[PDB]
Each structure stands twice: as structure tokens, then as C-alpha cells.
Design a protein around this ligand. Structure first.
Ligand code: NI
Lengths: 304, 304, 304
């Protein structure tokens, strides 16, 4: 209460998200500067289920800043009341947004959702950082994020899709959500409404469009992003949304391909796309590190 | 052998316990001074069962001192012989005092009992530190610990009660143990004898009194402390020892209420006491951190 | 690919192994010098099964160098591709040489085998360091490793025996392998061939001899080393290779006894040998620490 949390990426205003991106980018390039930013400070990091990516980037981020992360494998008020008088910051990877919200409710140090059924803001700072990084080096970033057309393909009733839509809205991107015309695979109306309100409120110039044909949705786009599809006959509804060569063939000449991982080479995309030349997946996953250092640093302090 | 351990709080003489309290208090207030006290030094921390409180305070304490704790989740001679040539200090949370004593026997670095069936000295430095802190800020500490009347309510055949009785004896406090007149719920004679001997030997001016009526036991007292009661018909014997509003109504006007946690709101106390205005429980649990830094620091060196 | 790994000790040329030994020895004696060698740098440490020795020495080594180890309890390409853009170095304790080789294949930071079915190079730097240390203090090291006759007793189809044979070949020692004349308990021909080739290629002056009588094999030797034998009637084949008092009575007057641990007092050796006066086992196990700091430091950089 009055402590700032990060339960979704829209916990940030547009300039805060753009500051975090640039800070991540400067910590990537100039780590020697940040080497004592969290000296003697600790992050308490709950995981209800392992994620190599999340755990290694978090634990490494703190070492690079000169502090330490407690890997804590799994009353909540009492727990939160008690850790907030010991640790400086907390991330938690819990099943539902409920447990995450409950913990944050009573916590008096910043709490960061390290993935739940409603968002994944650590990934969001990672991905938009990767997009700025990639396009800037190719000299395609004169128009900033504004000119980068983004498409998400696949199961779109999805915490990752929710948070990408929010990042795009915040950053003023054209976001296309390419999903099966099926109630169980589309973004939730609440999430669309949040996005259209944040673009309205900040006049970001962003837009949200829902396509039910990935090729039509991906025509002209600069980023194609997909993620894990995981009786298993979601496959019949999802298969037309596999990112393949014909899908990538309709995108811009500058396009890049992203997937937050774990990747399954014959589900959400073909091995030829992920292992092909438009794929930024591994550099994107490494960027979890630098985007984590930026987020922790910022919540450890708060400004700028 | 010839290495100093901390298996109970009476491993310390009265001035060492009072030094640890003041060091904890100064590390609370002035952490910047202690920031390199354990630089490059590691604590090996065994847990046979998780305790969020114990683990987070230990791991955080070392970071704050600039060192590191190995969270080690679970021959003992060979183990201890081997870790004593690698690590600088060791804490262990093991089932019985036996395993703890065995490990310490062969260990050649300091070993600290992080909770067993016979004591909890890390909690003891925490609690007496909290008592000094609270009463000092209220201006009720002119007579030091000497004037603070202390009462423990509940199941008193209990490692926590044992170690509170020892802390009180050491510090020269009037300690009242409020328990059911029942062989299975009273302090053990060995523990009473140790306490009466330490007060005798140091002329501490402390006293130990056993009451079988918590209200009678708590009349006039300045601290009321209870802890977890956990077929489950210990409840019929324990219920007259619940710390409720009528119990707290007989204590001093300055009194405070303590519980080392986990708290169960309708067992050892009512929700109105723990969530009411005399409760110091959460600040007390946070003080695990600073009392841990003091204990580790001291055993890492030894003097003063 | 083009990243240097350490999957066996023969990943090192003879001078690199001798440099690591001397560095370990200088870090033992002068730790204050090495206190910022891994500042802000992290080691990712996978364990498919706990080893107190391996885990504590690794985690402590990094703290002493000023960095941090992630204890990671257990696609491999994707995993390795991803951790190589976050962490600085990796050790892994995996079942087979296969998984270890697979991980290393795709990894772009140094990977170190922390024990598999084919080697144990962290132990190797430990043991030869212990041998140099012990004999140097006794003034028995004028002839360096060259004059120290080494014998391994026991089950010799063994990753530890493999890597000792390699260390000896590298260092130019007479190595005697004392094993049961039984296909399942002898070194593998591939390992003998590697050793005879490394001595040939570097003209180390080392030799490999296979004895089927431990007393005959140990006659005159300066080091007797054994390790864990673990329906359980391997005991009938192994029992003539128990290191007992009559075995140690045939060695040099300067001899020492080694066992990498865990020790079972009535299997691979008698309690009188391991607890007797020739035993260096515990100082040897503590030396895991300093030999770990040397190996990590070296792979973190690479030269000298
Ligand atoms: Ni750690």
C-alpha cells in the first residue's frame, strides 16, 4: 500500500517502460557502471515451479548489481509482513494472479510477478528491449517503437499475449493478435479494454487488432512472436496458427521472429523459423538478464 | 573442541548476551558500518525442515555483512571435519539436540543451533533485542532488563520456553512460566536447575516461577509471550492458557505481546491480541535479521 | 566450440595442470589476494545428485573469489545457448559423460564436469595439490611429482581411477593400478591408451602399470589411494584389494593414504588406515575448496 509493485507491465507508464529499456540496454553494454547498485541488498525469489530462464536471470542479475537473490522454492499476510522487514525486494512465480495479488497486498517492499496467469513483465522488458536492440543495430529505429508493427500468433488467451498487448499499447505499437476464432483462444475483453484505455489515456498512437488468419495478420509485420501451445486436440484449433515459412514470407524484409521459450519446434513454429535467419530467440532469452537488472534496480530505488 | 558453539543461549555469559543485543541494535540502526564484516566468508546453513524466518534472516544477514550463506537442504564426523576446512561458520536446523551435538562435537568452525528440541538461541537474541528496543523507545528501560517482568504462556515443555527461561535467568529477569499443571506441559527439571544455577553463579537477580493459572501468572507482567500449540486434545489441557483479552487486561499498562511465529489466531492467542495494539510480533520477526547478523559476526570473530 | 571445457583432467596440458596446482596452493596460503577475481561473476552449478563436498567447495570457492554460484538442482542445446549469454561459467554433475558432452557441445562459456562416469577433474586438481602440499612440507619434493610413486587400489573401472591415471601420466608419475584380474574391475583400454599417448606426446616420463595383487602393486609406493566400492557380491572380488595395515606396511616410509570420499571404514579400507597416521583424507577433502577456486579462476580468464 503505497509500495509500487509490478504485477503486469502496465504497472508502468510509457516513459517508465522506455526508461527501463534504455537502462537494460546501458547495463548490457556498460555493466562495470552498475556493479555496486544492489551491494548488500537481497532479493527474495519464490518459485512455485522452476524456470531456468527466470531463476538464472534473477540470481545472476543480483550478482551483477552486487547483491544476492534467495532462491525460495515452494499466512501470506504474515509471510509478506515478515519478509518486508528483512529483504529489499521480492519476485514470485506463483500459479494464479490471486496468490500474487494477496502477497503483494500485504508486502511493504516491491513485489514483481515473475510469471502468473495474467502477466510476465520481466519478459516484457526483455522482449521490447530485444526489439529496440535488434532494429537499432540494423538502422531501422528512426521511428522508434512507433513504426515497428508487431504480431502475436497462437493461443491468445494467454498471460504472455496479455502482457505483449499491454507493452505495445504503452509503447504505441500496432499490435496484431493472430488467434483462432474461438472463445477459448482469444484475448479476454478485459485485457483489450485495458489496452485501448492506456493508448487513449497517454495518446500513445498504439493500436490493437485481432486477426483470425495469421497470414493476413502477419502481412507487413516487423516482429512475429509466438509461444508454447502447451485430448491434446488444441492442435486442431491451433495448427493454422503455426508460424511457418509461408507465414514469415508475408512479413517485412526487416522482420524478426521471437518466442519467449520453451520452444517446441513442430508446434507453435517450425524448426526452419526458429533456427532460421529471422530468429532472435536465444539473444532474446539472454536479455532476460539485463532487463532483470534494470527492473530490480529501478524498484530497489524508483526513479528516473 | 575448544571451538565455541551456540547450542542454547546459555552458551553465552550474561555480558555476551547483552553485547549481542546492543550489537544487533546498532546493526539495525547503522547497517552501513557492518557492510564488509563477512566479506568473502560463507555460512553453511543446513535445514532438515524449512523455516522461512530462519532461512531468510540467515541468508539476508550474510549479504548485509558482505558474505554468503549456503542453503543446504536435508558420517557426521566426516561431514563436519570436511566443512570445517571450507566454510567459516555453520548453522543447522535438525530434529534432535543429538544430531546437533554430534555435528558440533566434530566441527572445528562455530556451529549454531537454528532450532532443535532443546533451544532456539537465534530467536533468543531476537526477542530480548526486541524487548530492549521496544521499552527503550517508550522510555521504560531505566532499570534495563532487570525491571521487565516476563511471562511465557502455554505448552512449556518446549525448546522455545527452555531458551526464554535461560535468557531471562542470564539477564536477571523475573520469568513466570504459565503452564498446565500436567507433567507433559511443564518445563523439565533439568532446565529449571540450569536457570537457577546461572542466576546463582552470576548473581543476575533473575528468578523463575511456575504458575498453573496464566492470569495469576500474567498479573503485573510487562511481556506476555506465547507460541504454537502444534487426538488433537492437547486443546483441552491448553485452552485455559490461551492468551486472550482478559489475560492481557491483567498485565502492566506498558506491556507488550510477543510470539516467535508461526501464529495460529485461535489457538495460543486470540486474533484480537496478535492484531491488537500490544502486539510486537512482526517487528519481532524482522529482528531475526539483525540478531542473526550479530550472532554470525560474533562467532565469525569472538570478541567483545 | 572454441570454448575450452574441462570434461577430464587431460583437457589440460601438463604445465596447465602444474600451474593450477601452484595457483591452488597460493590461494590456500594467500586468499586475501584473490578476493575480487570473480567479483560480479556467477557460476551456474547443476547437480543431478547432491555431493556435499562438490557443492560446498564450489559455492564457497566463488564467495572467496567474490562472485556467486547458483546451485541448480535437477532442449539441452537451448538451455546451454541460453545460460551462456547470462552466466560466466558452468559446472555440472550429471549421470553420464553423454549429457555432459551434449551440454558442453552447445555451451559458449566454460563447462566443467563436477563428476560423471568418465572423470572428476575438480577432484584431480585437489588430490595432486594435496600430494604436492604434503610432500613439500615433509621436504620430500626435490624430485617434484616425478619421484612420487602412486598406487590406486580397488575397483578400477572407475571414473576416479581414469582421471588419476590421466593426472599421473600428465605429471610424469609412476602410477600402479591395483585391481582384481576381472574384466569388470580393470581400467578400460581406451583410458590406458590415452595415458600412454599423453606420456609419449609430452615425454612426461610417467608410466602406467596394472597389478592384480595390491601388496605387490603397493610395494615401495608413496601414495595409496582408494575409493568407494559402492548381489553385493562385488565384495568377493574386491576384498583382496582392501587397503589394510599389511598393504600400508609395504609402502615407503614417507607414504601417505588418500580417499576422495565418502569413506566406508570396512570396505575399501580399514578404519585403522583412514584414521591412522598416513591418512590425509580430511585435509584432502578441504582442498576441494582451493583447487576449485583455481580451476574456476583459470576458466573464467584462461591464461598462465
Ligand atoms: Ni547464493
Amino acid at each position: 500500500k503505497q509500495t509500487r509493485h509490478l504485477l503486469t507491465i502496465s504497472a508502468l507508464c510509457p516513459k517508465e517502460l522506455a526508461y527501463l529499456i534504455d537502462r537494460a540496454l546501458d547495463m548490457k553494454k556498460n555493466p562495470a557502471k552498475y556493479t555496486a547498485r544492489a551491494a548488500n541488498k537481497t532479493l527474495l525469489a519464490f518459485f512455485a515451479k522452476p524456470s531456468l530462464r527466470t531463476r538464472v536471470s534473477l540470481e545472476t542479475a543480483m550478482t551483477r548489481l552486487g547483491g544476492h537473490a534467495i532462491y525460495y522454492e515452494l499466512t501470506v499476510q504474515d509471510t509478506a509482513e515478515v519478509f518486508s522487514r528483512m529483504v529489499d525486494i521480492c519476485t514470485a512465480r506463483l500459479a494464479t494472479k490471486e496468490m500474487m495479488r494477496e502477497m503483494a497486498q500485504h508486502a511493504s517492499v516491491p513485489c514483481i510477478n515473475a510469471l502468473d496467469d495474467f502477466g510476465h513483465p520481466l519478459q516484457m522488458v526483455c522482449d521490447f528491449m530485444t526489439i529496440k536492440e535488434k532494429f537499432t543495430a540494423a538502422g531501422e529505429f528512426s521511428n522508434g517503437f512507433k513504426g515497428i508493427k508487431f504480431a502475436y500468433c497462437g493461443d491468445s488467451m494467454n498471460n504472455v499475449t496479455y502482457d505483449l498487448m499491454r507493452g505495445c499499447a504503452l509503447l504505441g505499437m500496432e499490435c496484431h493478435v493472430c488467434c483462432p476464432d474461438h472463445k477459448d483462444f482469444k484475448p479476454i475483453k478485459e485485457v483489450i479494454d485495458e489496452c485501448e484505455e492506456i493508448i487513449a489515456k497517454h495518446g500513445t498512437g498504439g493500436s490493437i487488432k485481432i486477426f483470425h488468419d495469421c497470414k493476413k495478420g502477419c502481412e507487413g509485420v516487423d516482429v512475429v512472436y509466438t509461444d508454447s501451445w502447451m485430448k491434446e486436440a488444441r492442435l486442431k484449433v491451433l495448427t493454422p496458427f503455426q508460424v511457418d515459412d509461408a507465414v514469415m514470407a508475408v512479413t517485412s524484409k526487416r522482420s524478426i521472429f521471437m518466442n519467449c521459450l520453451p520452444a517446441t519446434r513442430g508446434e507453435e513454429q517450425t524448426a526452419s523459423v526458429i533456427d532460421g535467419p529471422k530468429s532472435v530467440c536465444y539473444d532474446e532469452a539472454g536479455n532476460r538478464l539485463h532487463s532483470a537488472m534494470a527492473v530490480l534496480d529501478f524498484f530497489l530505488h524508483d526513479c528516473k
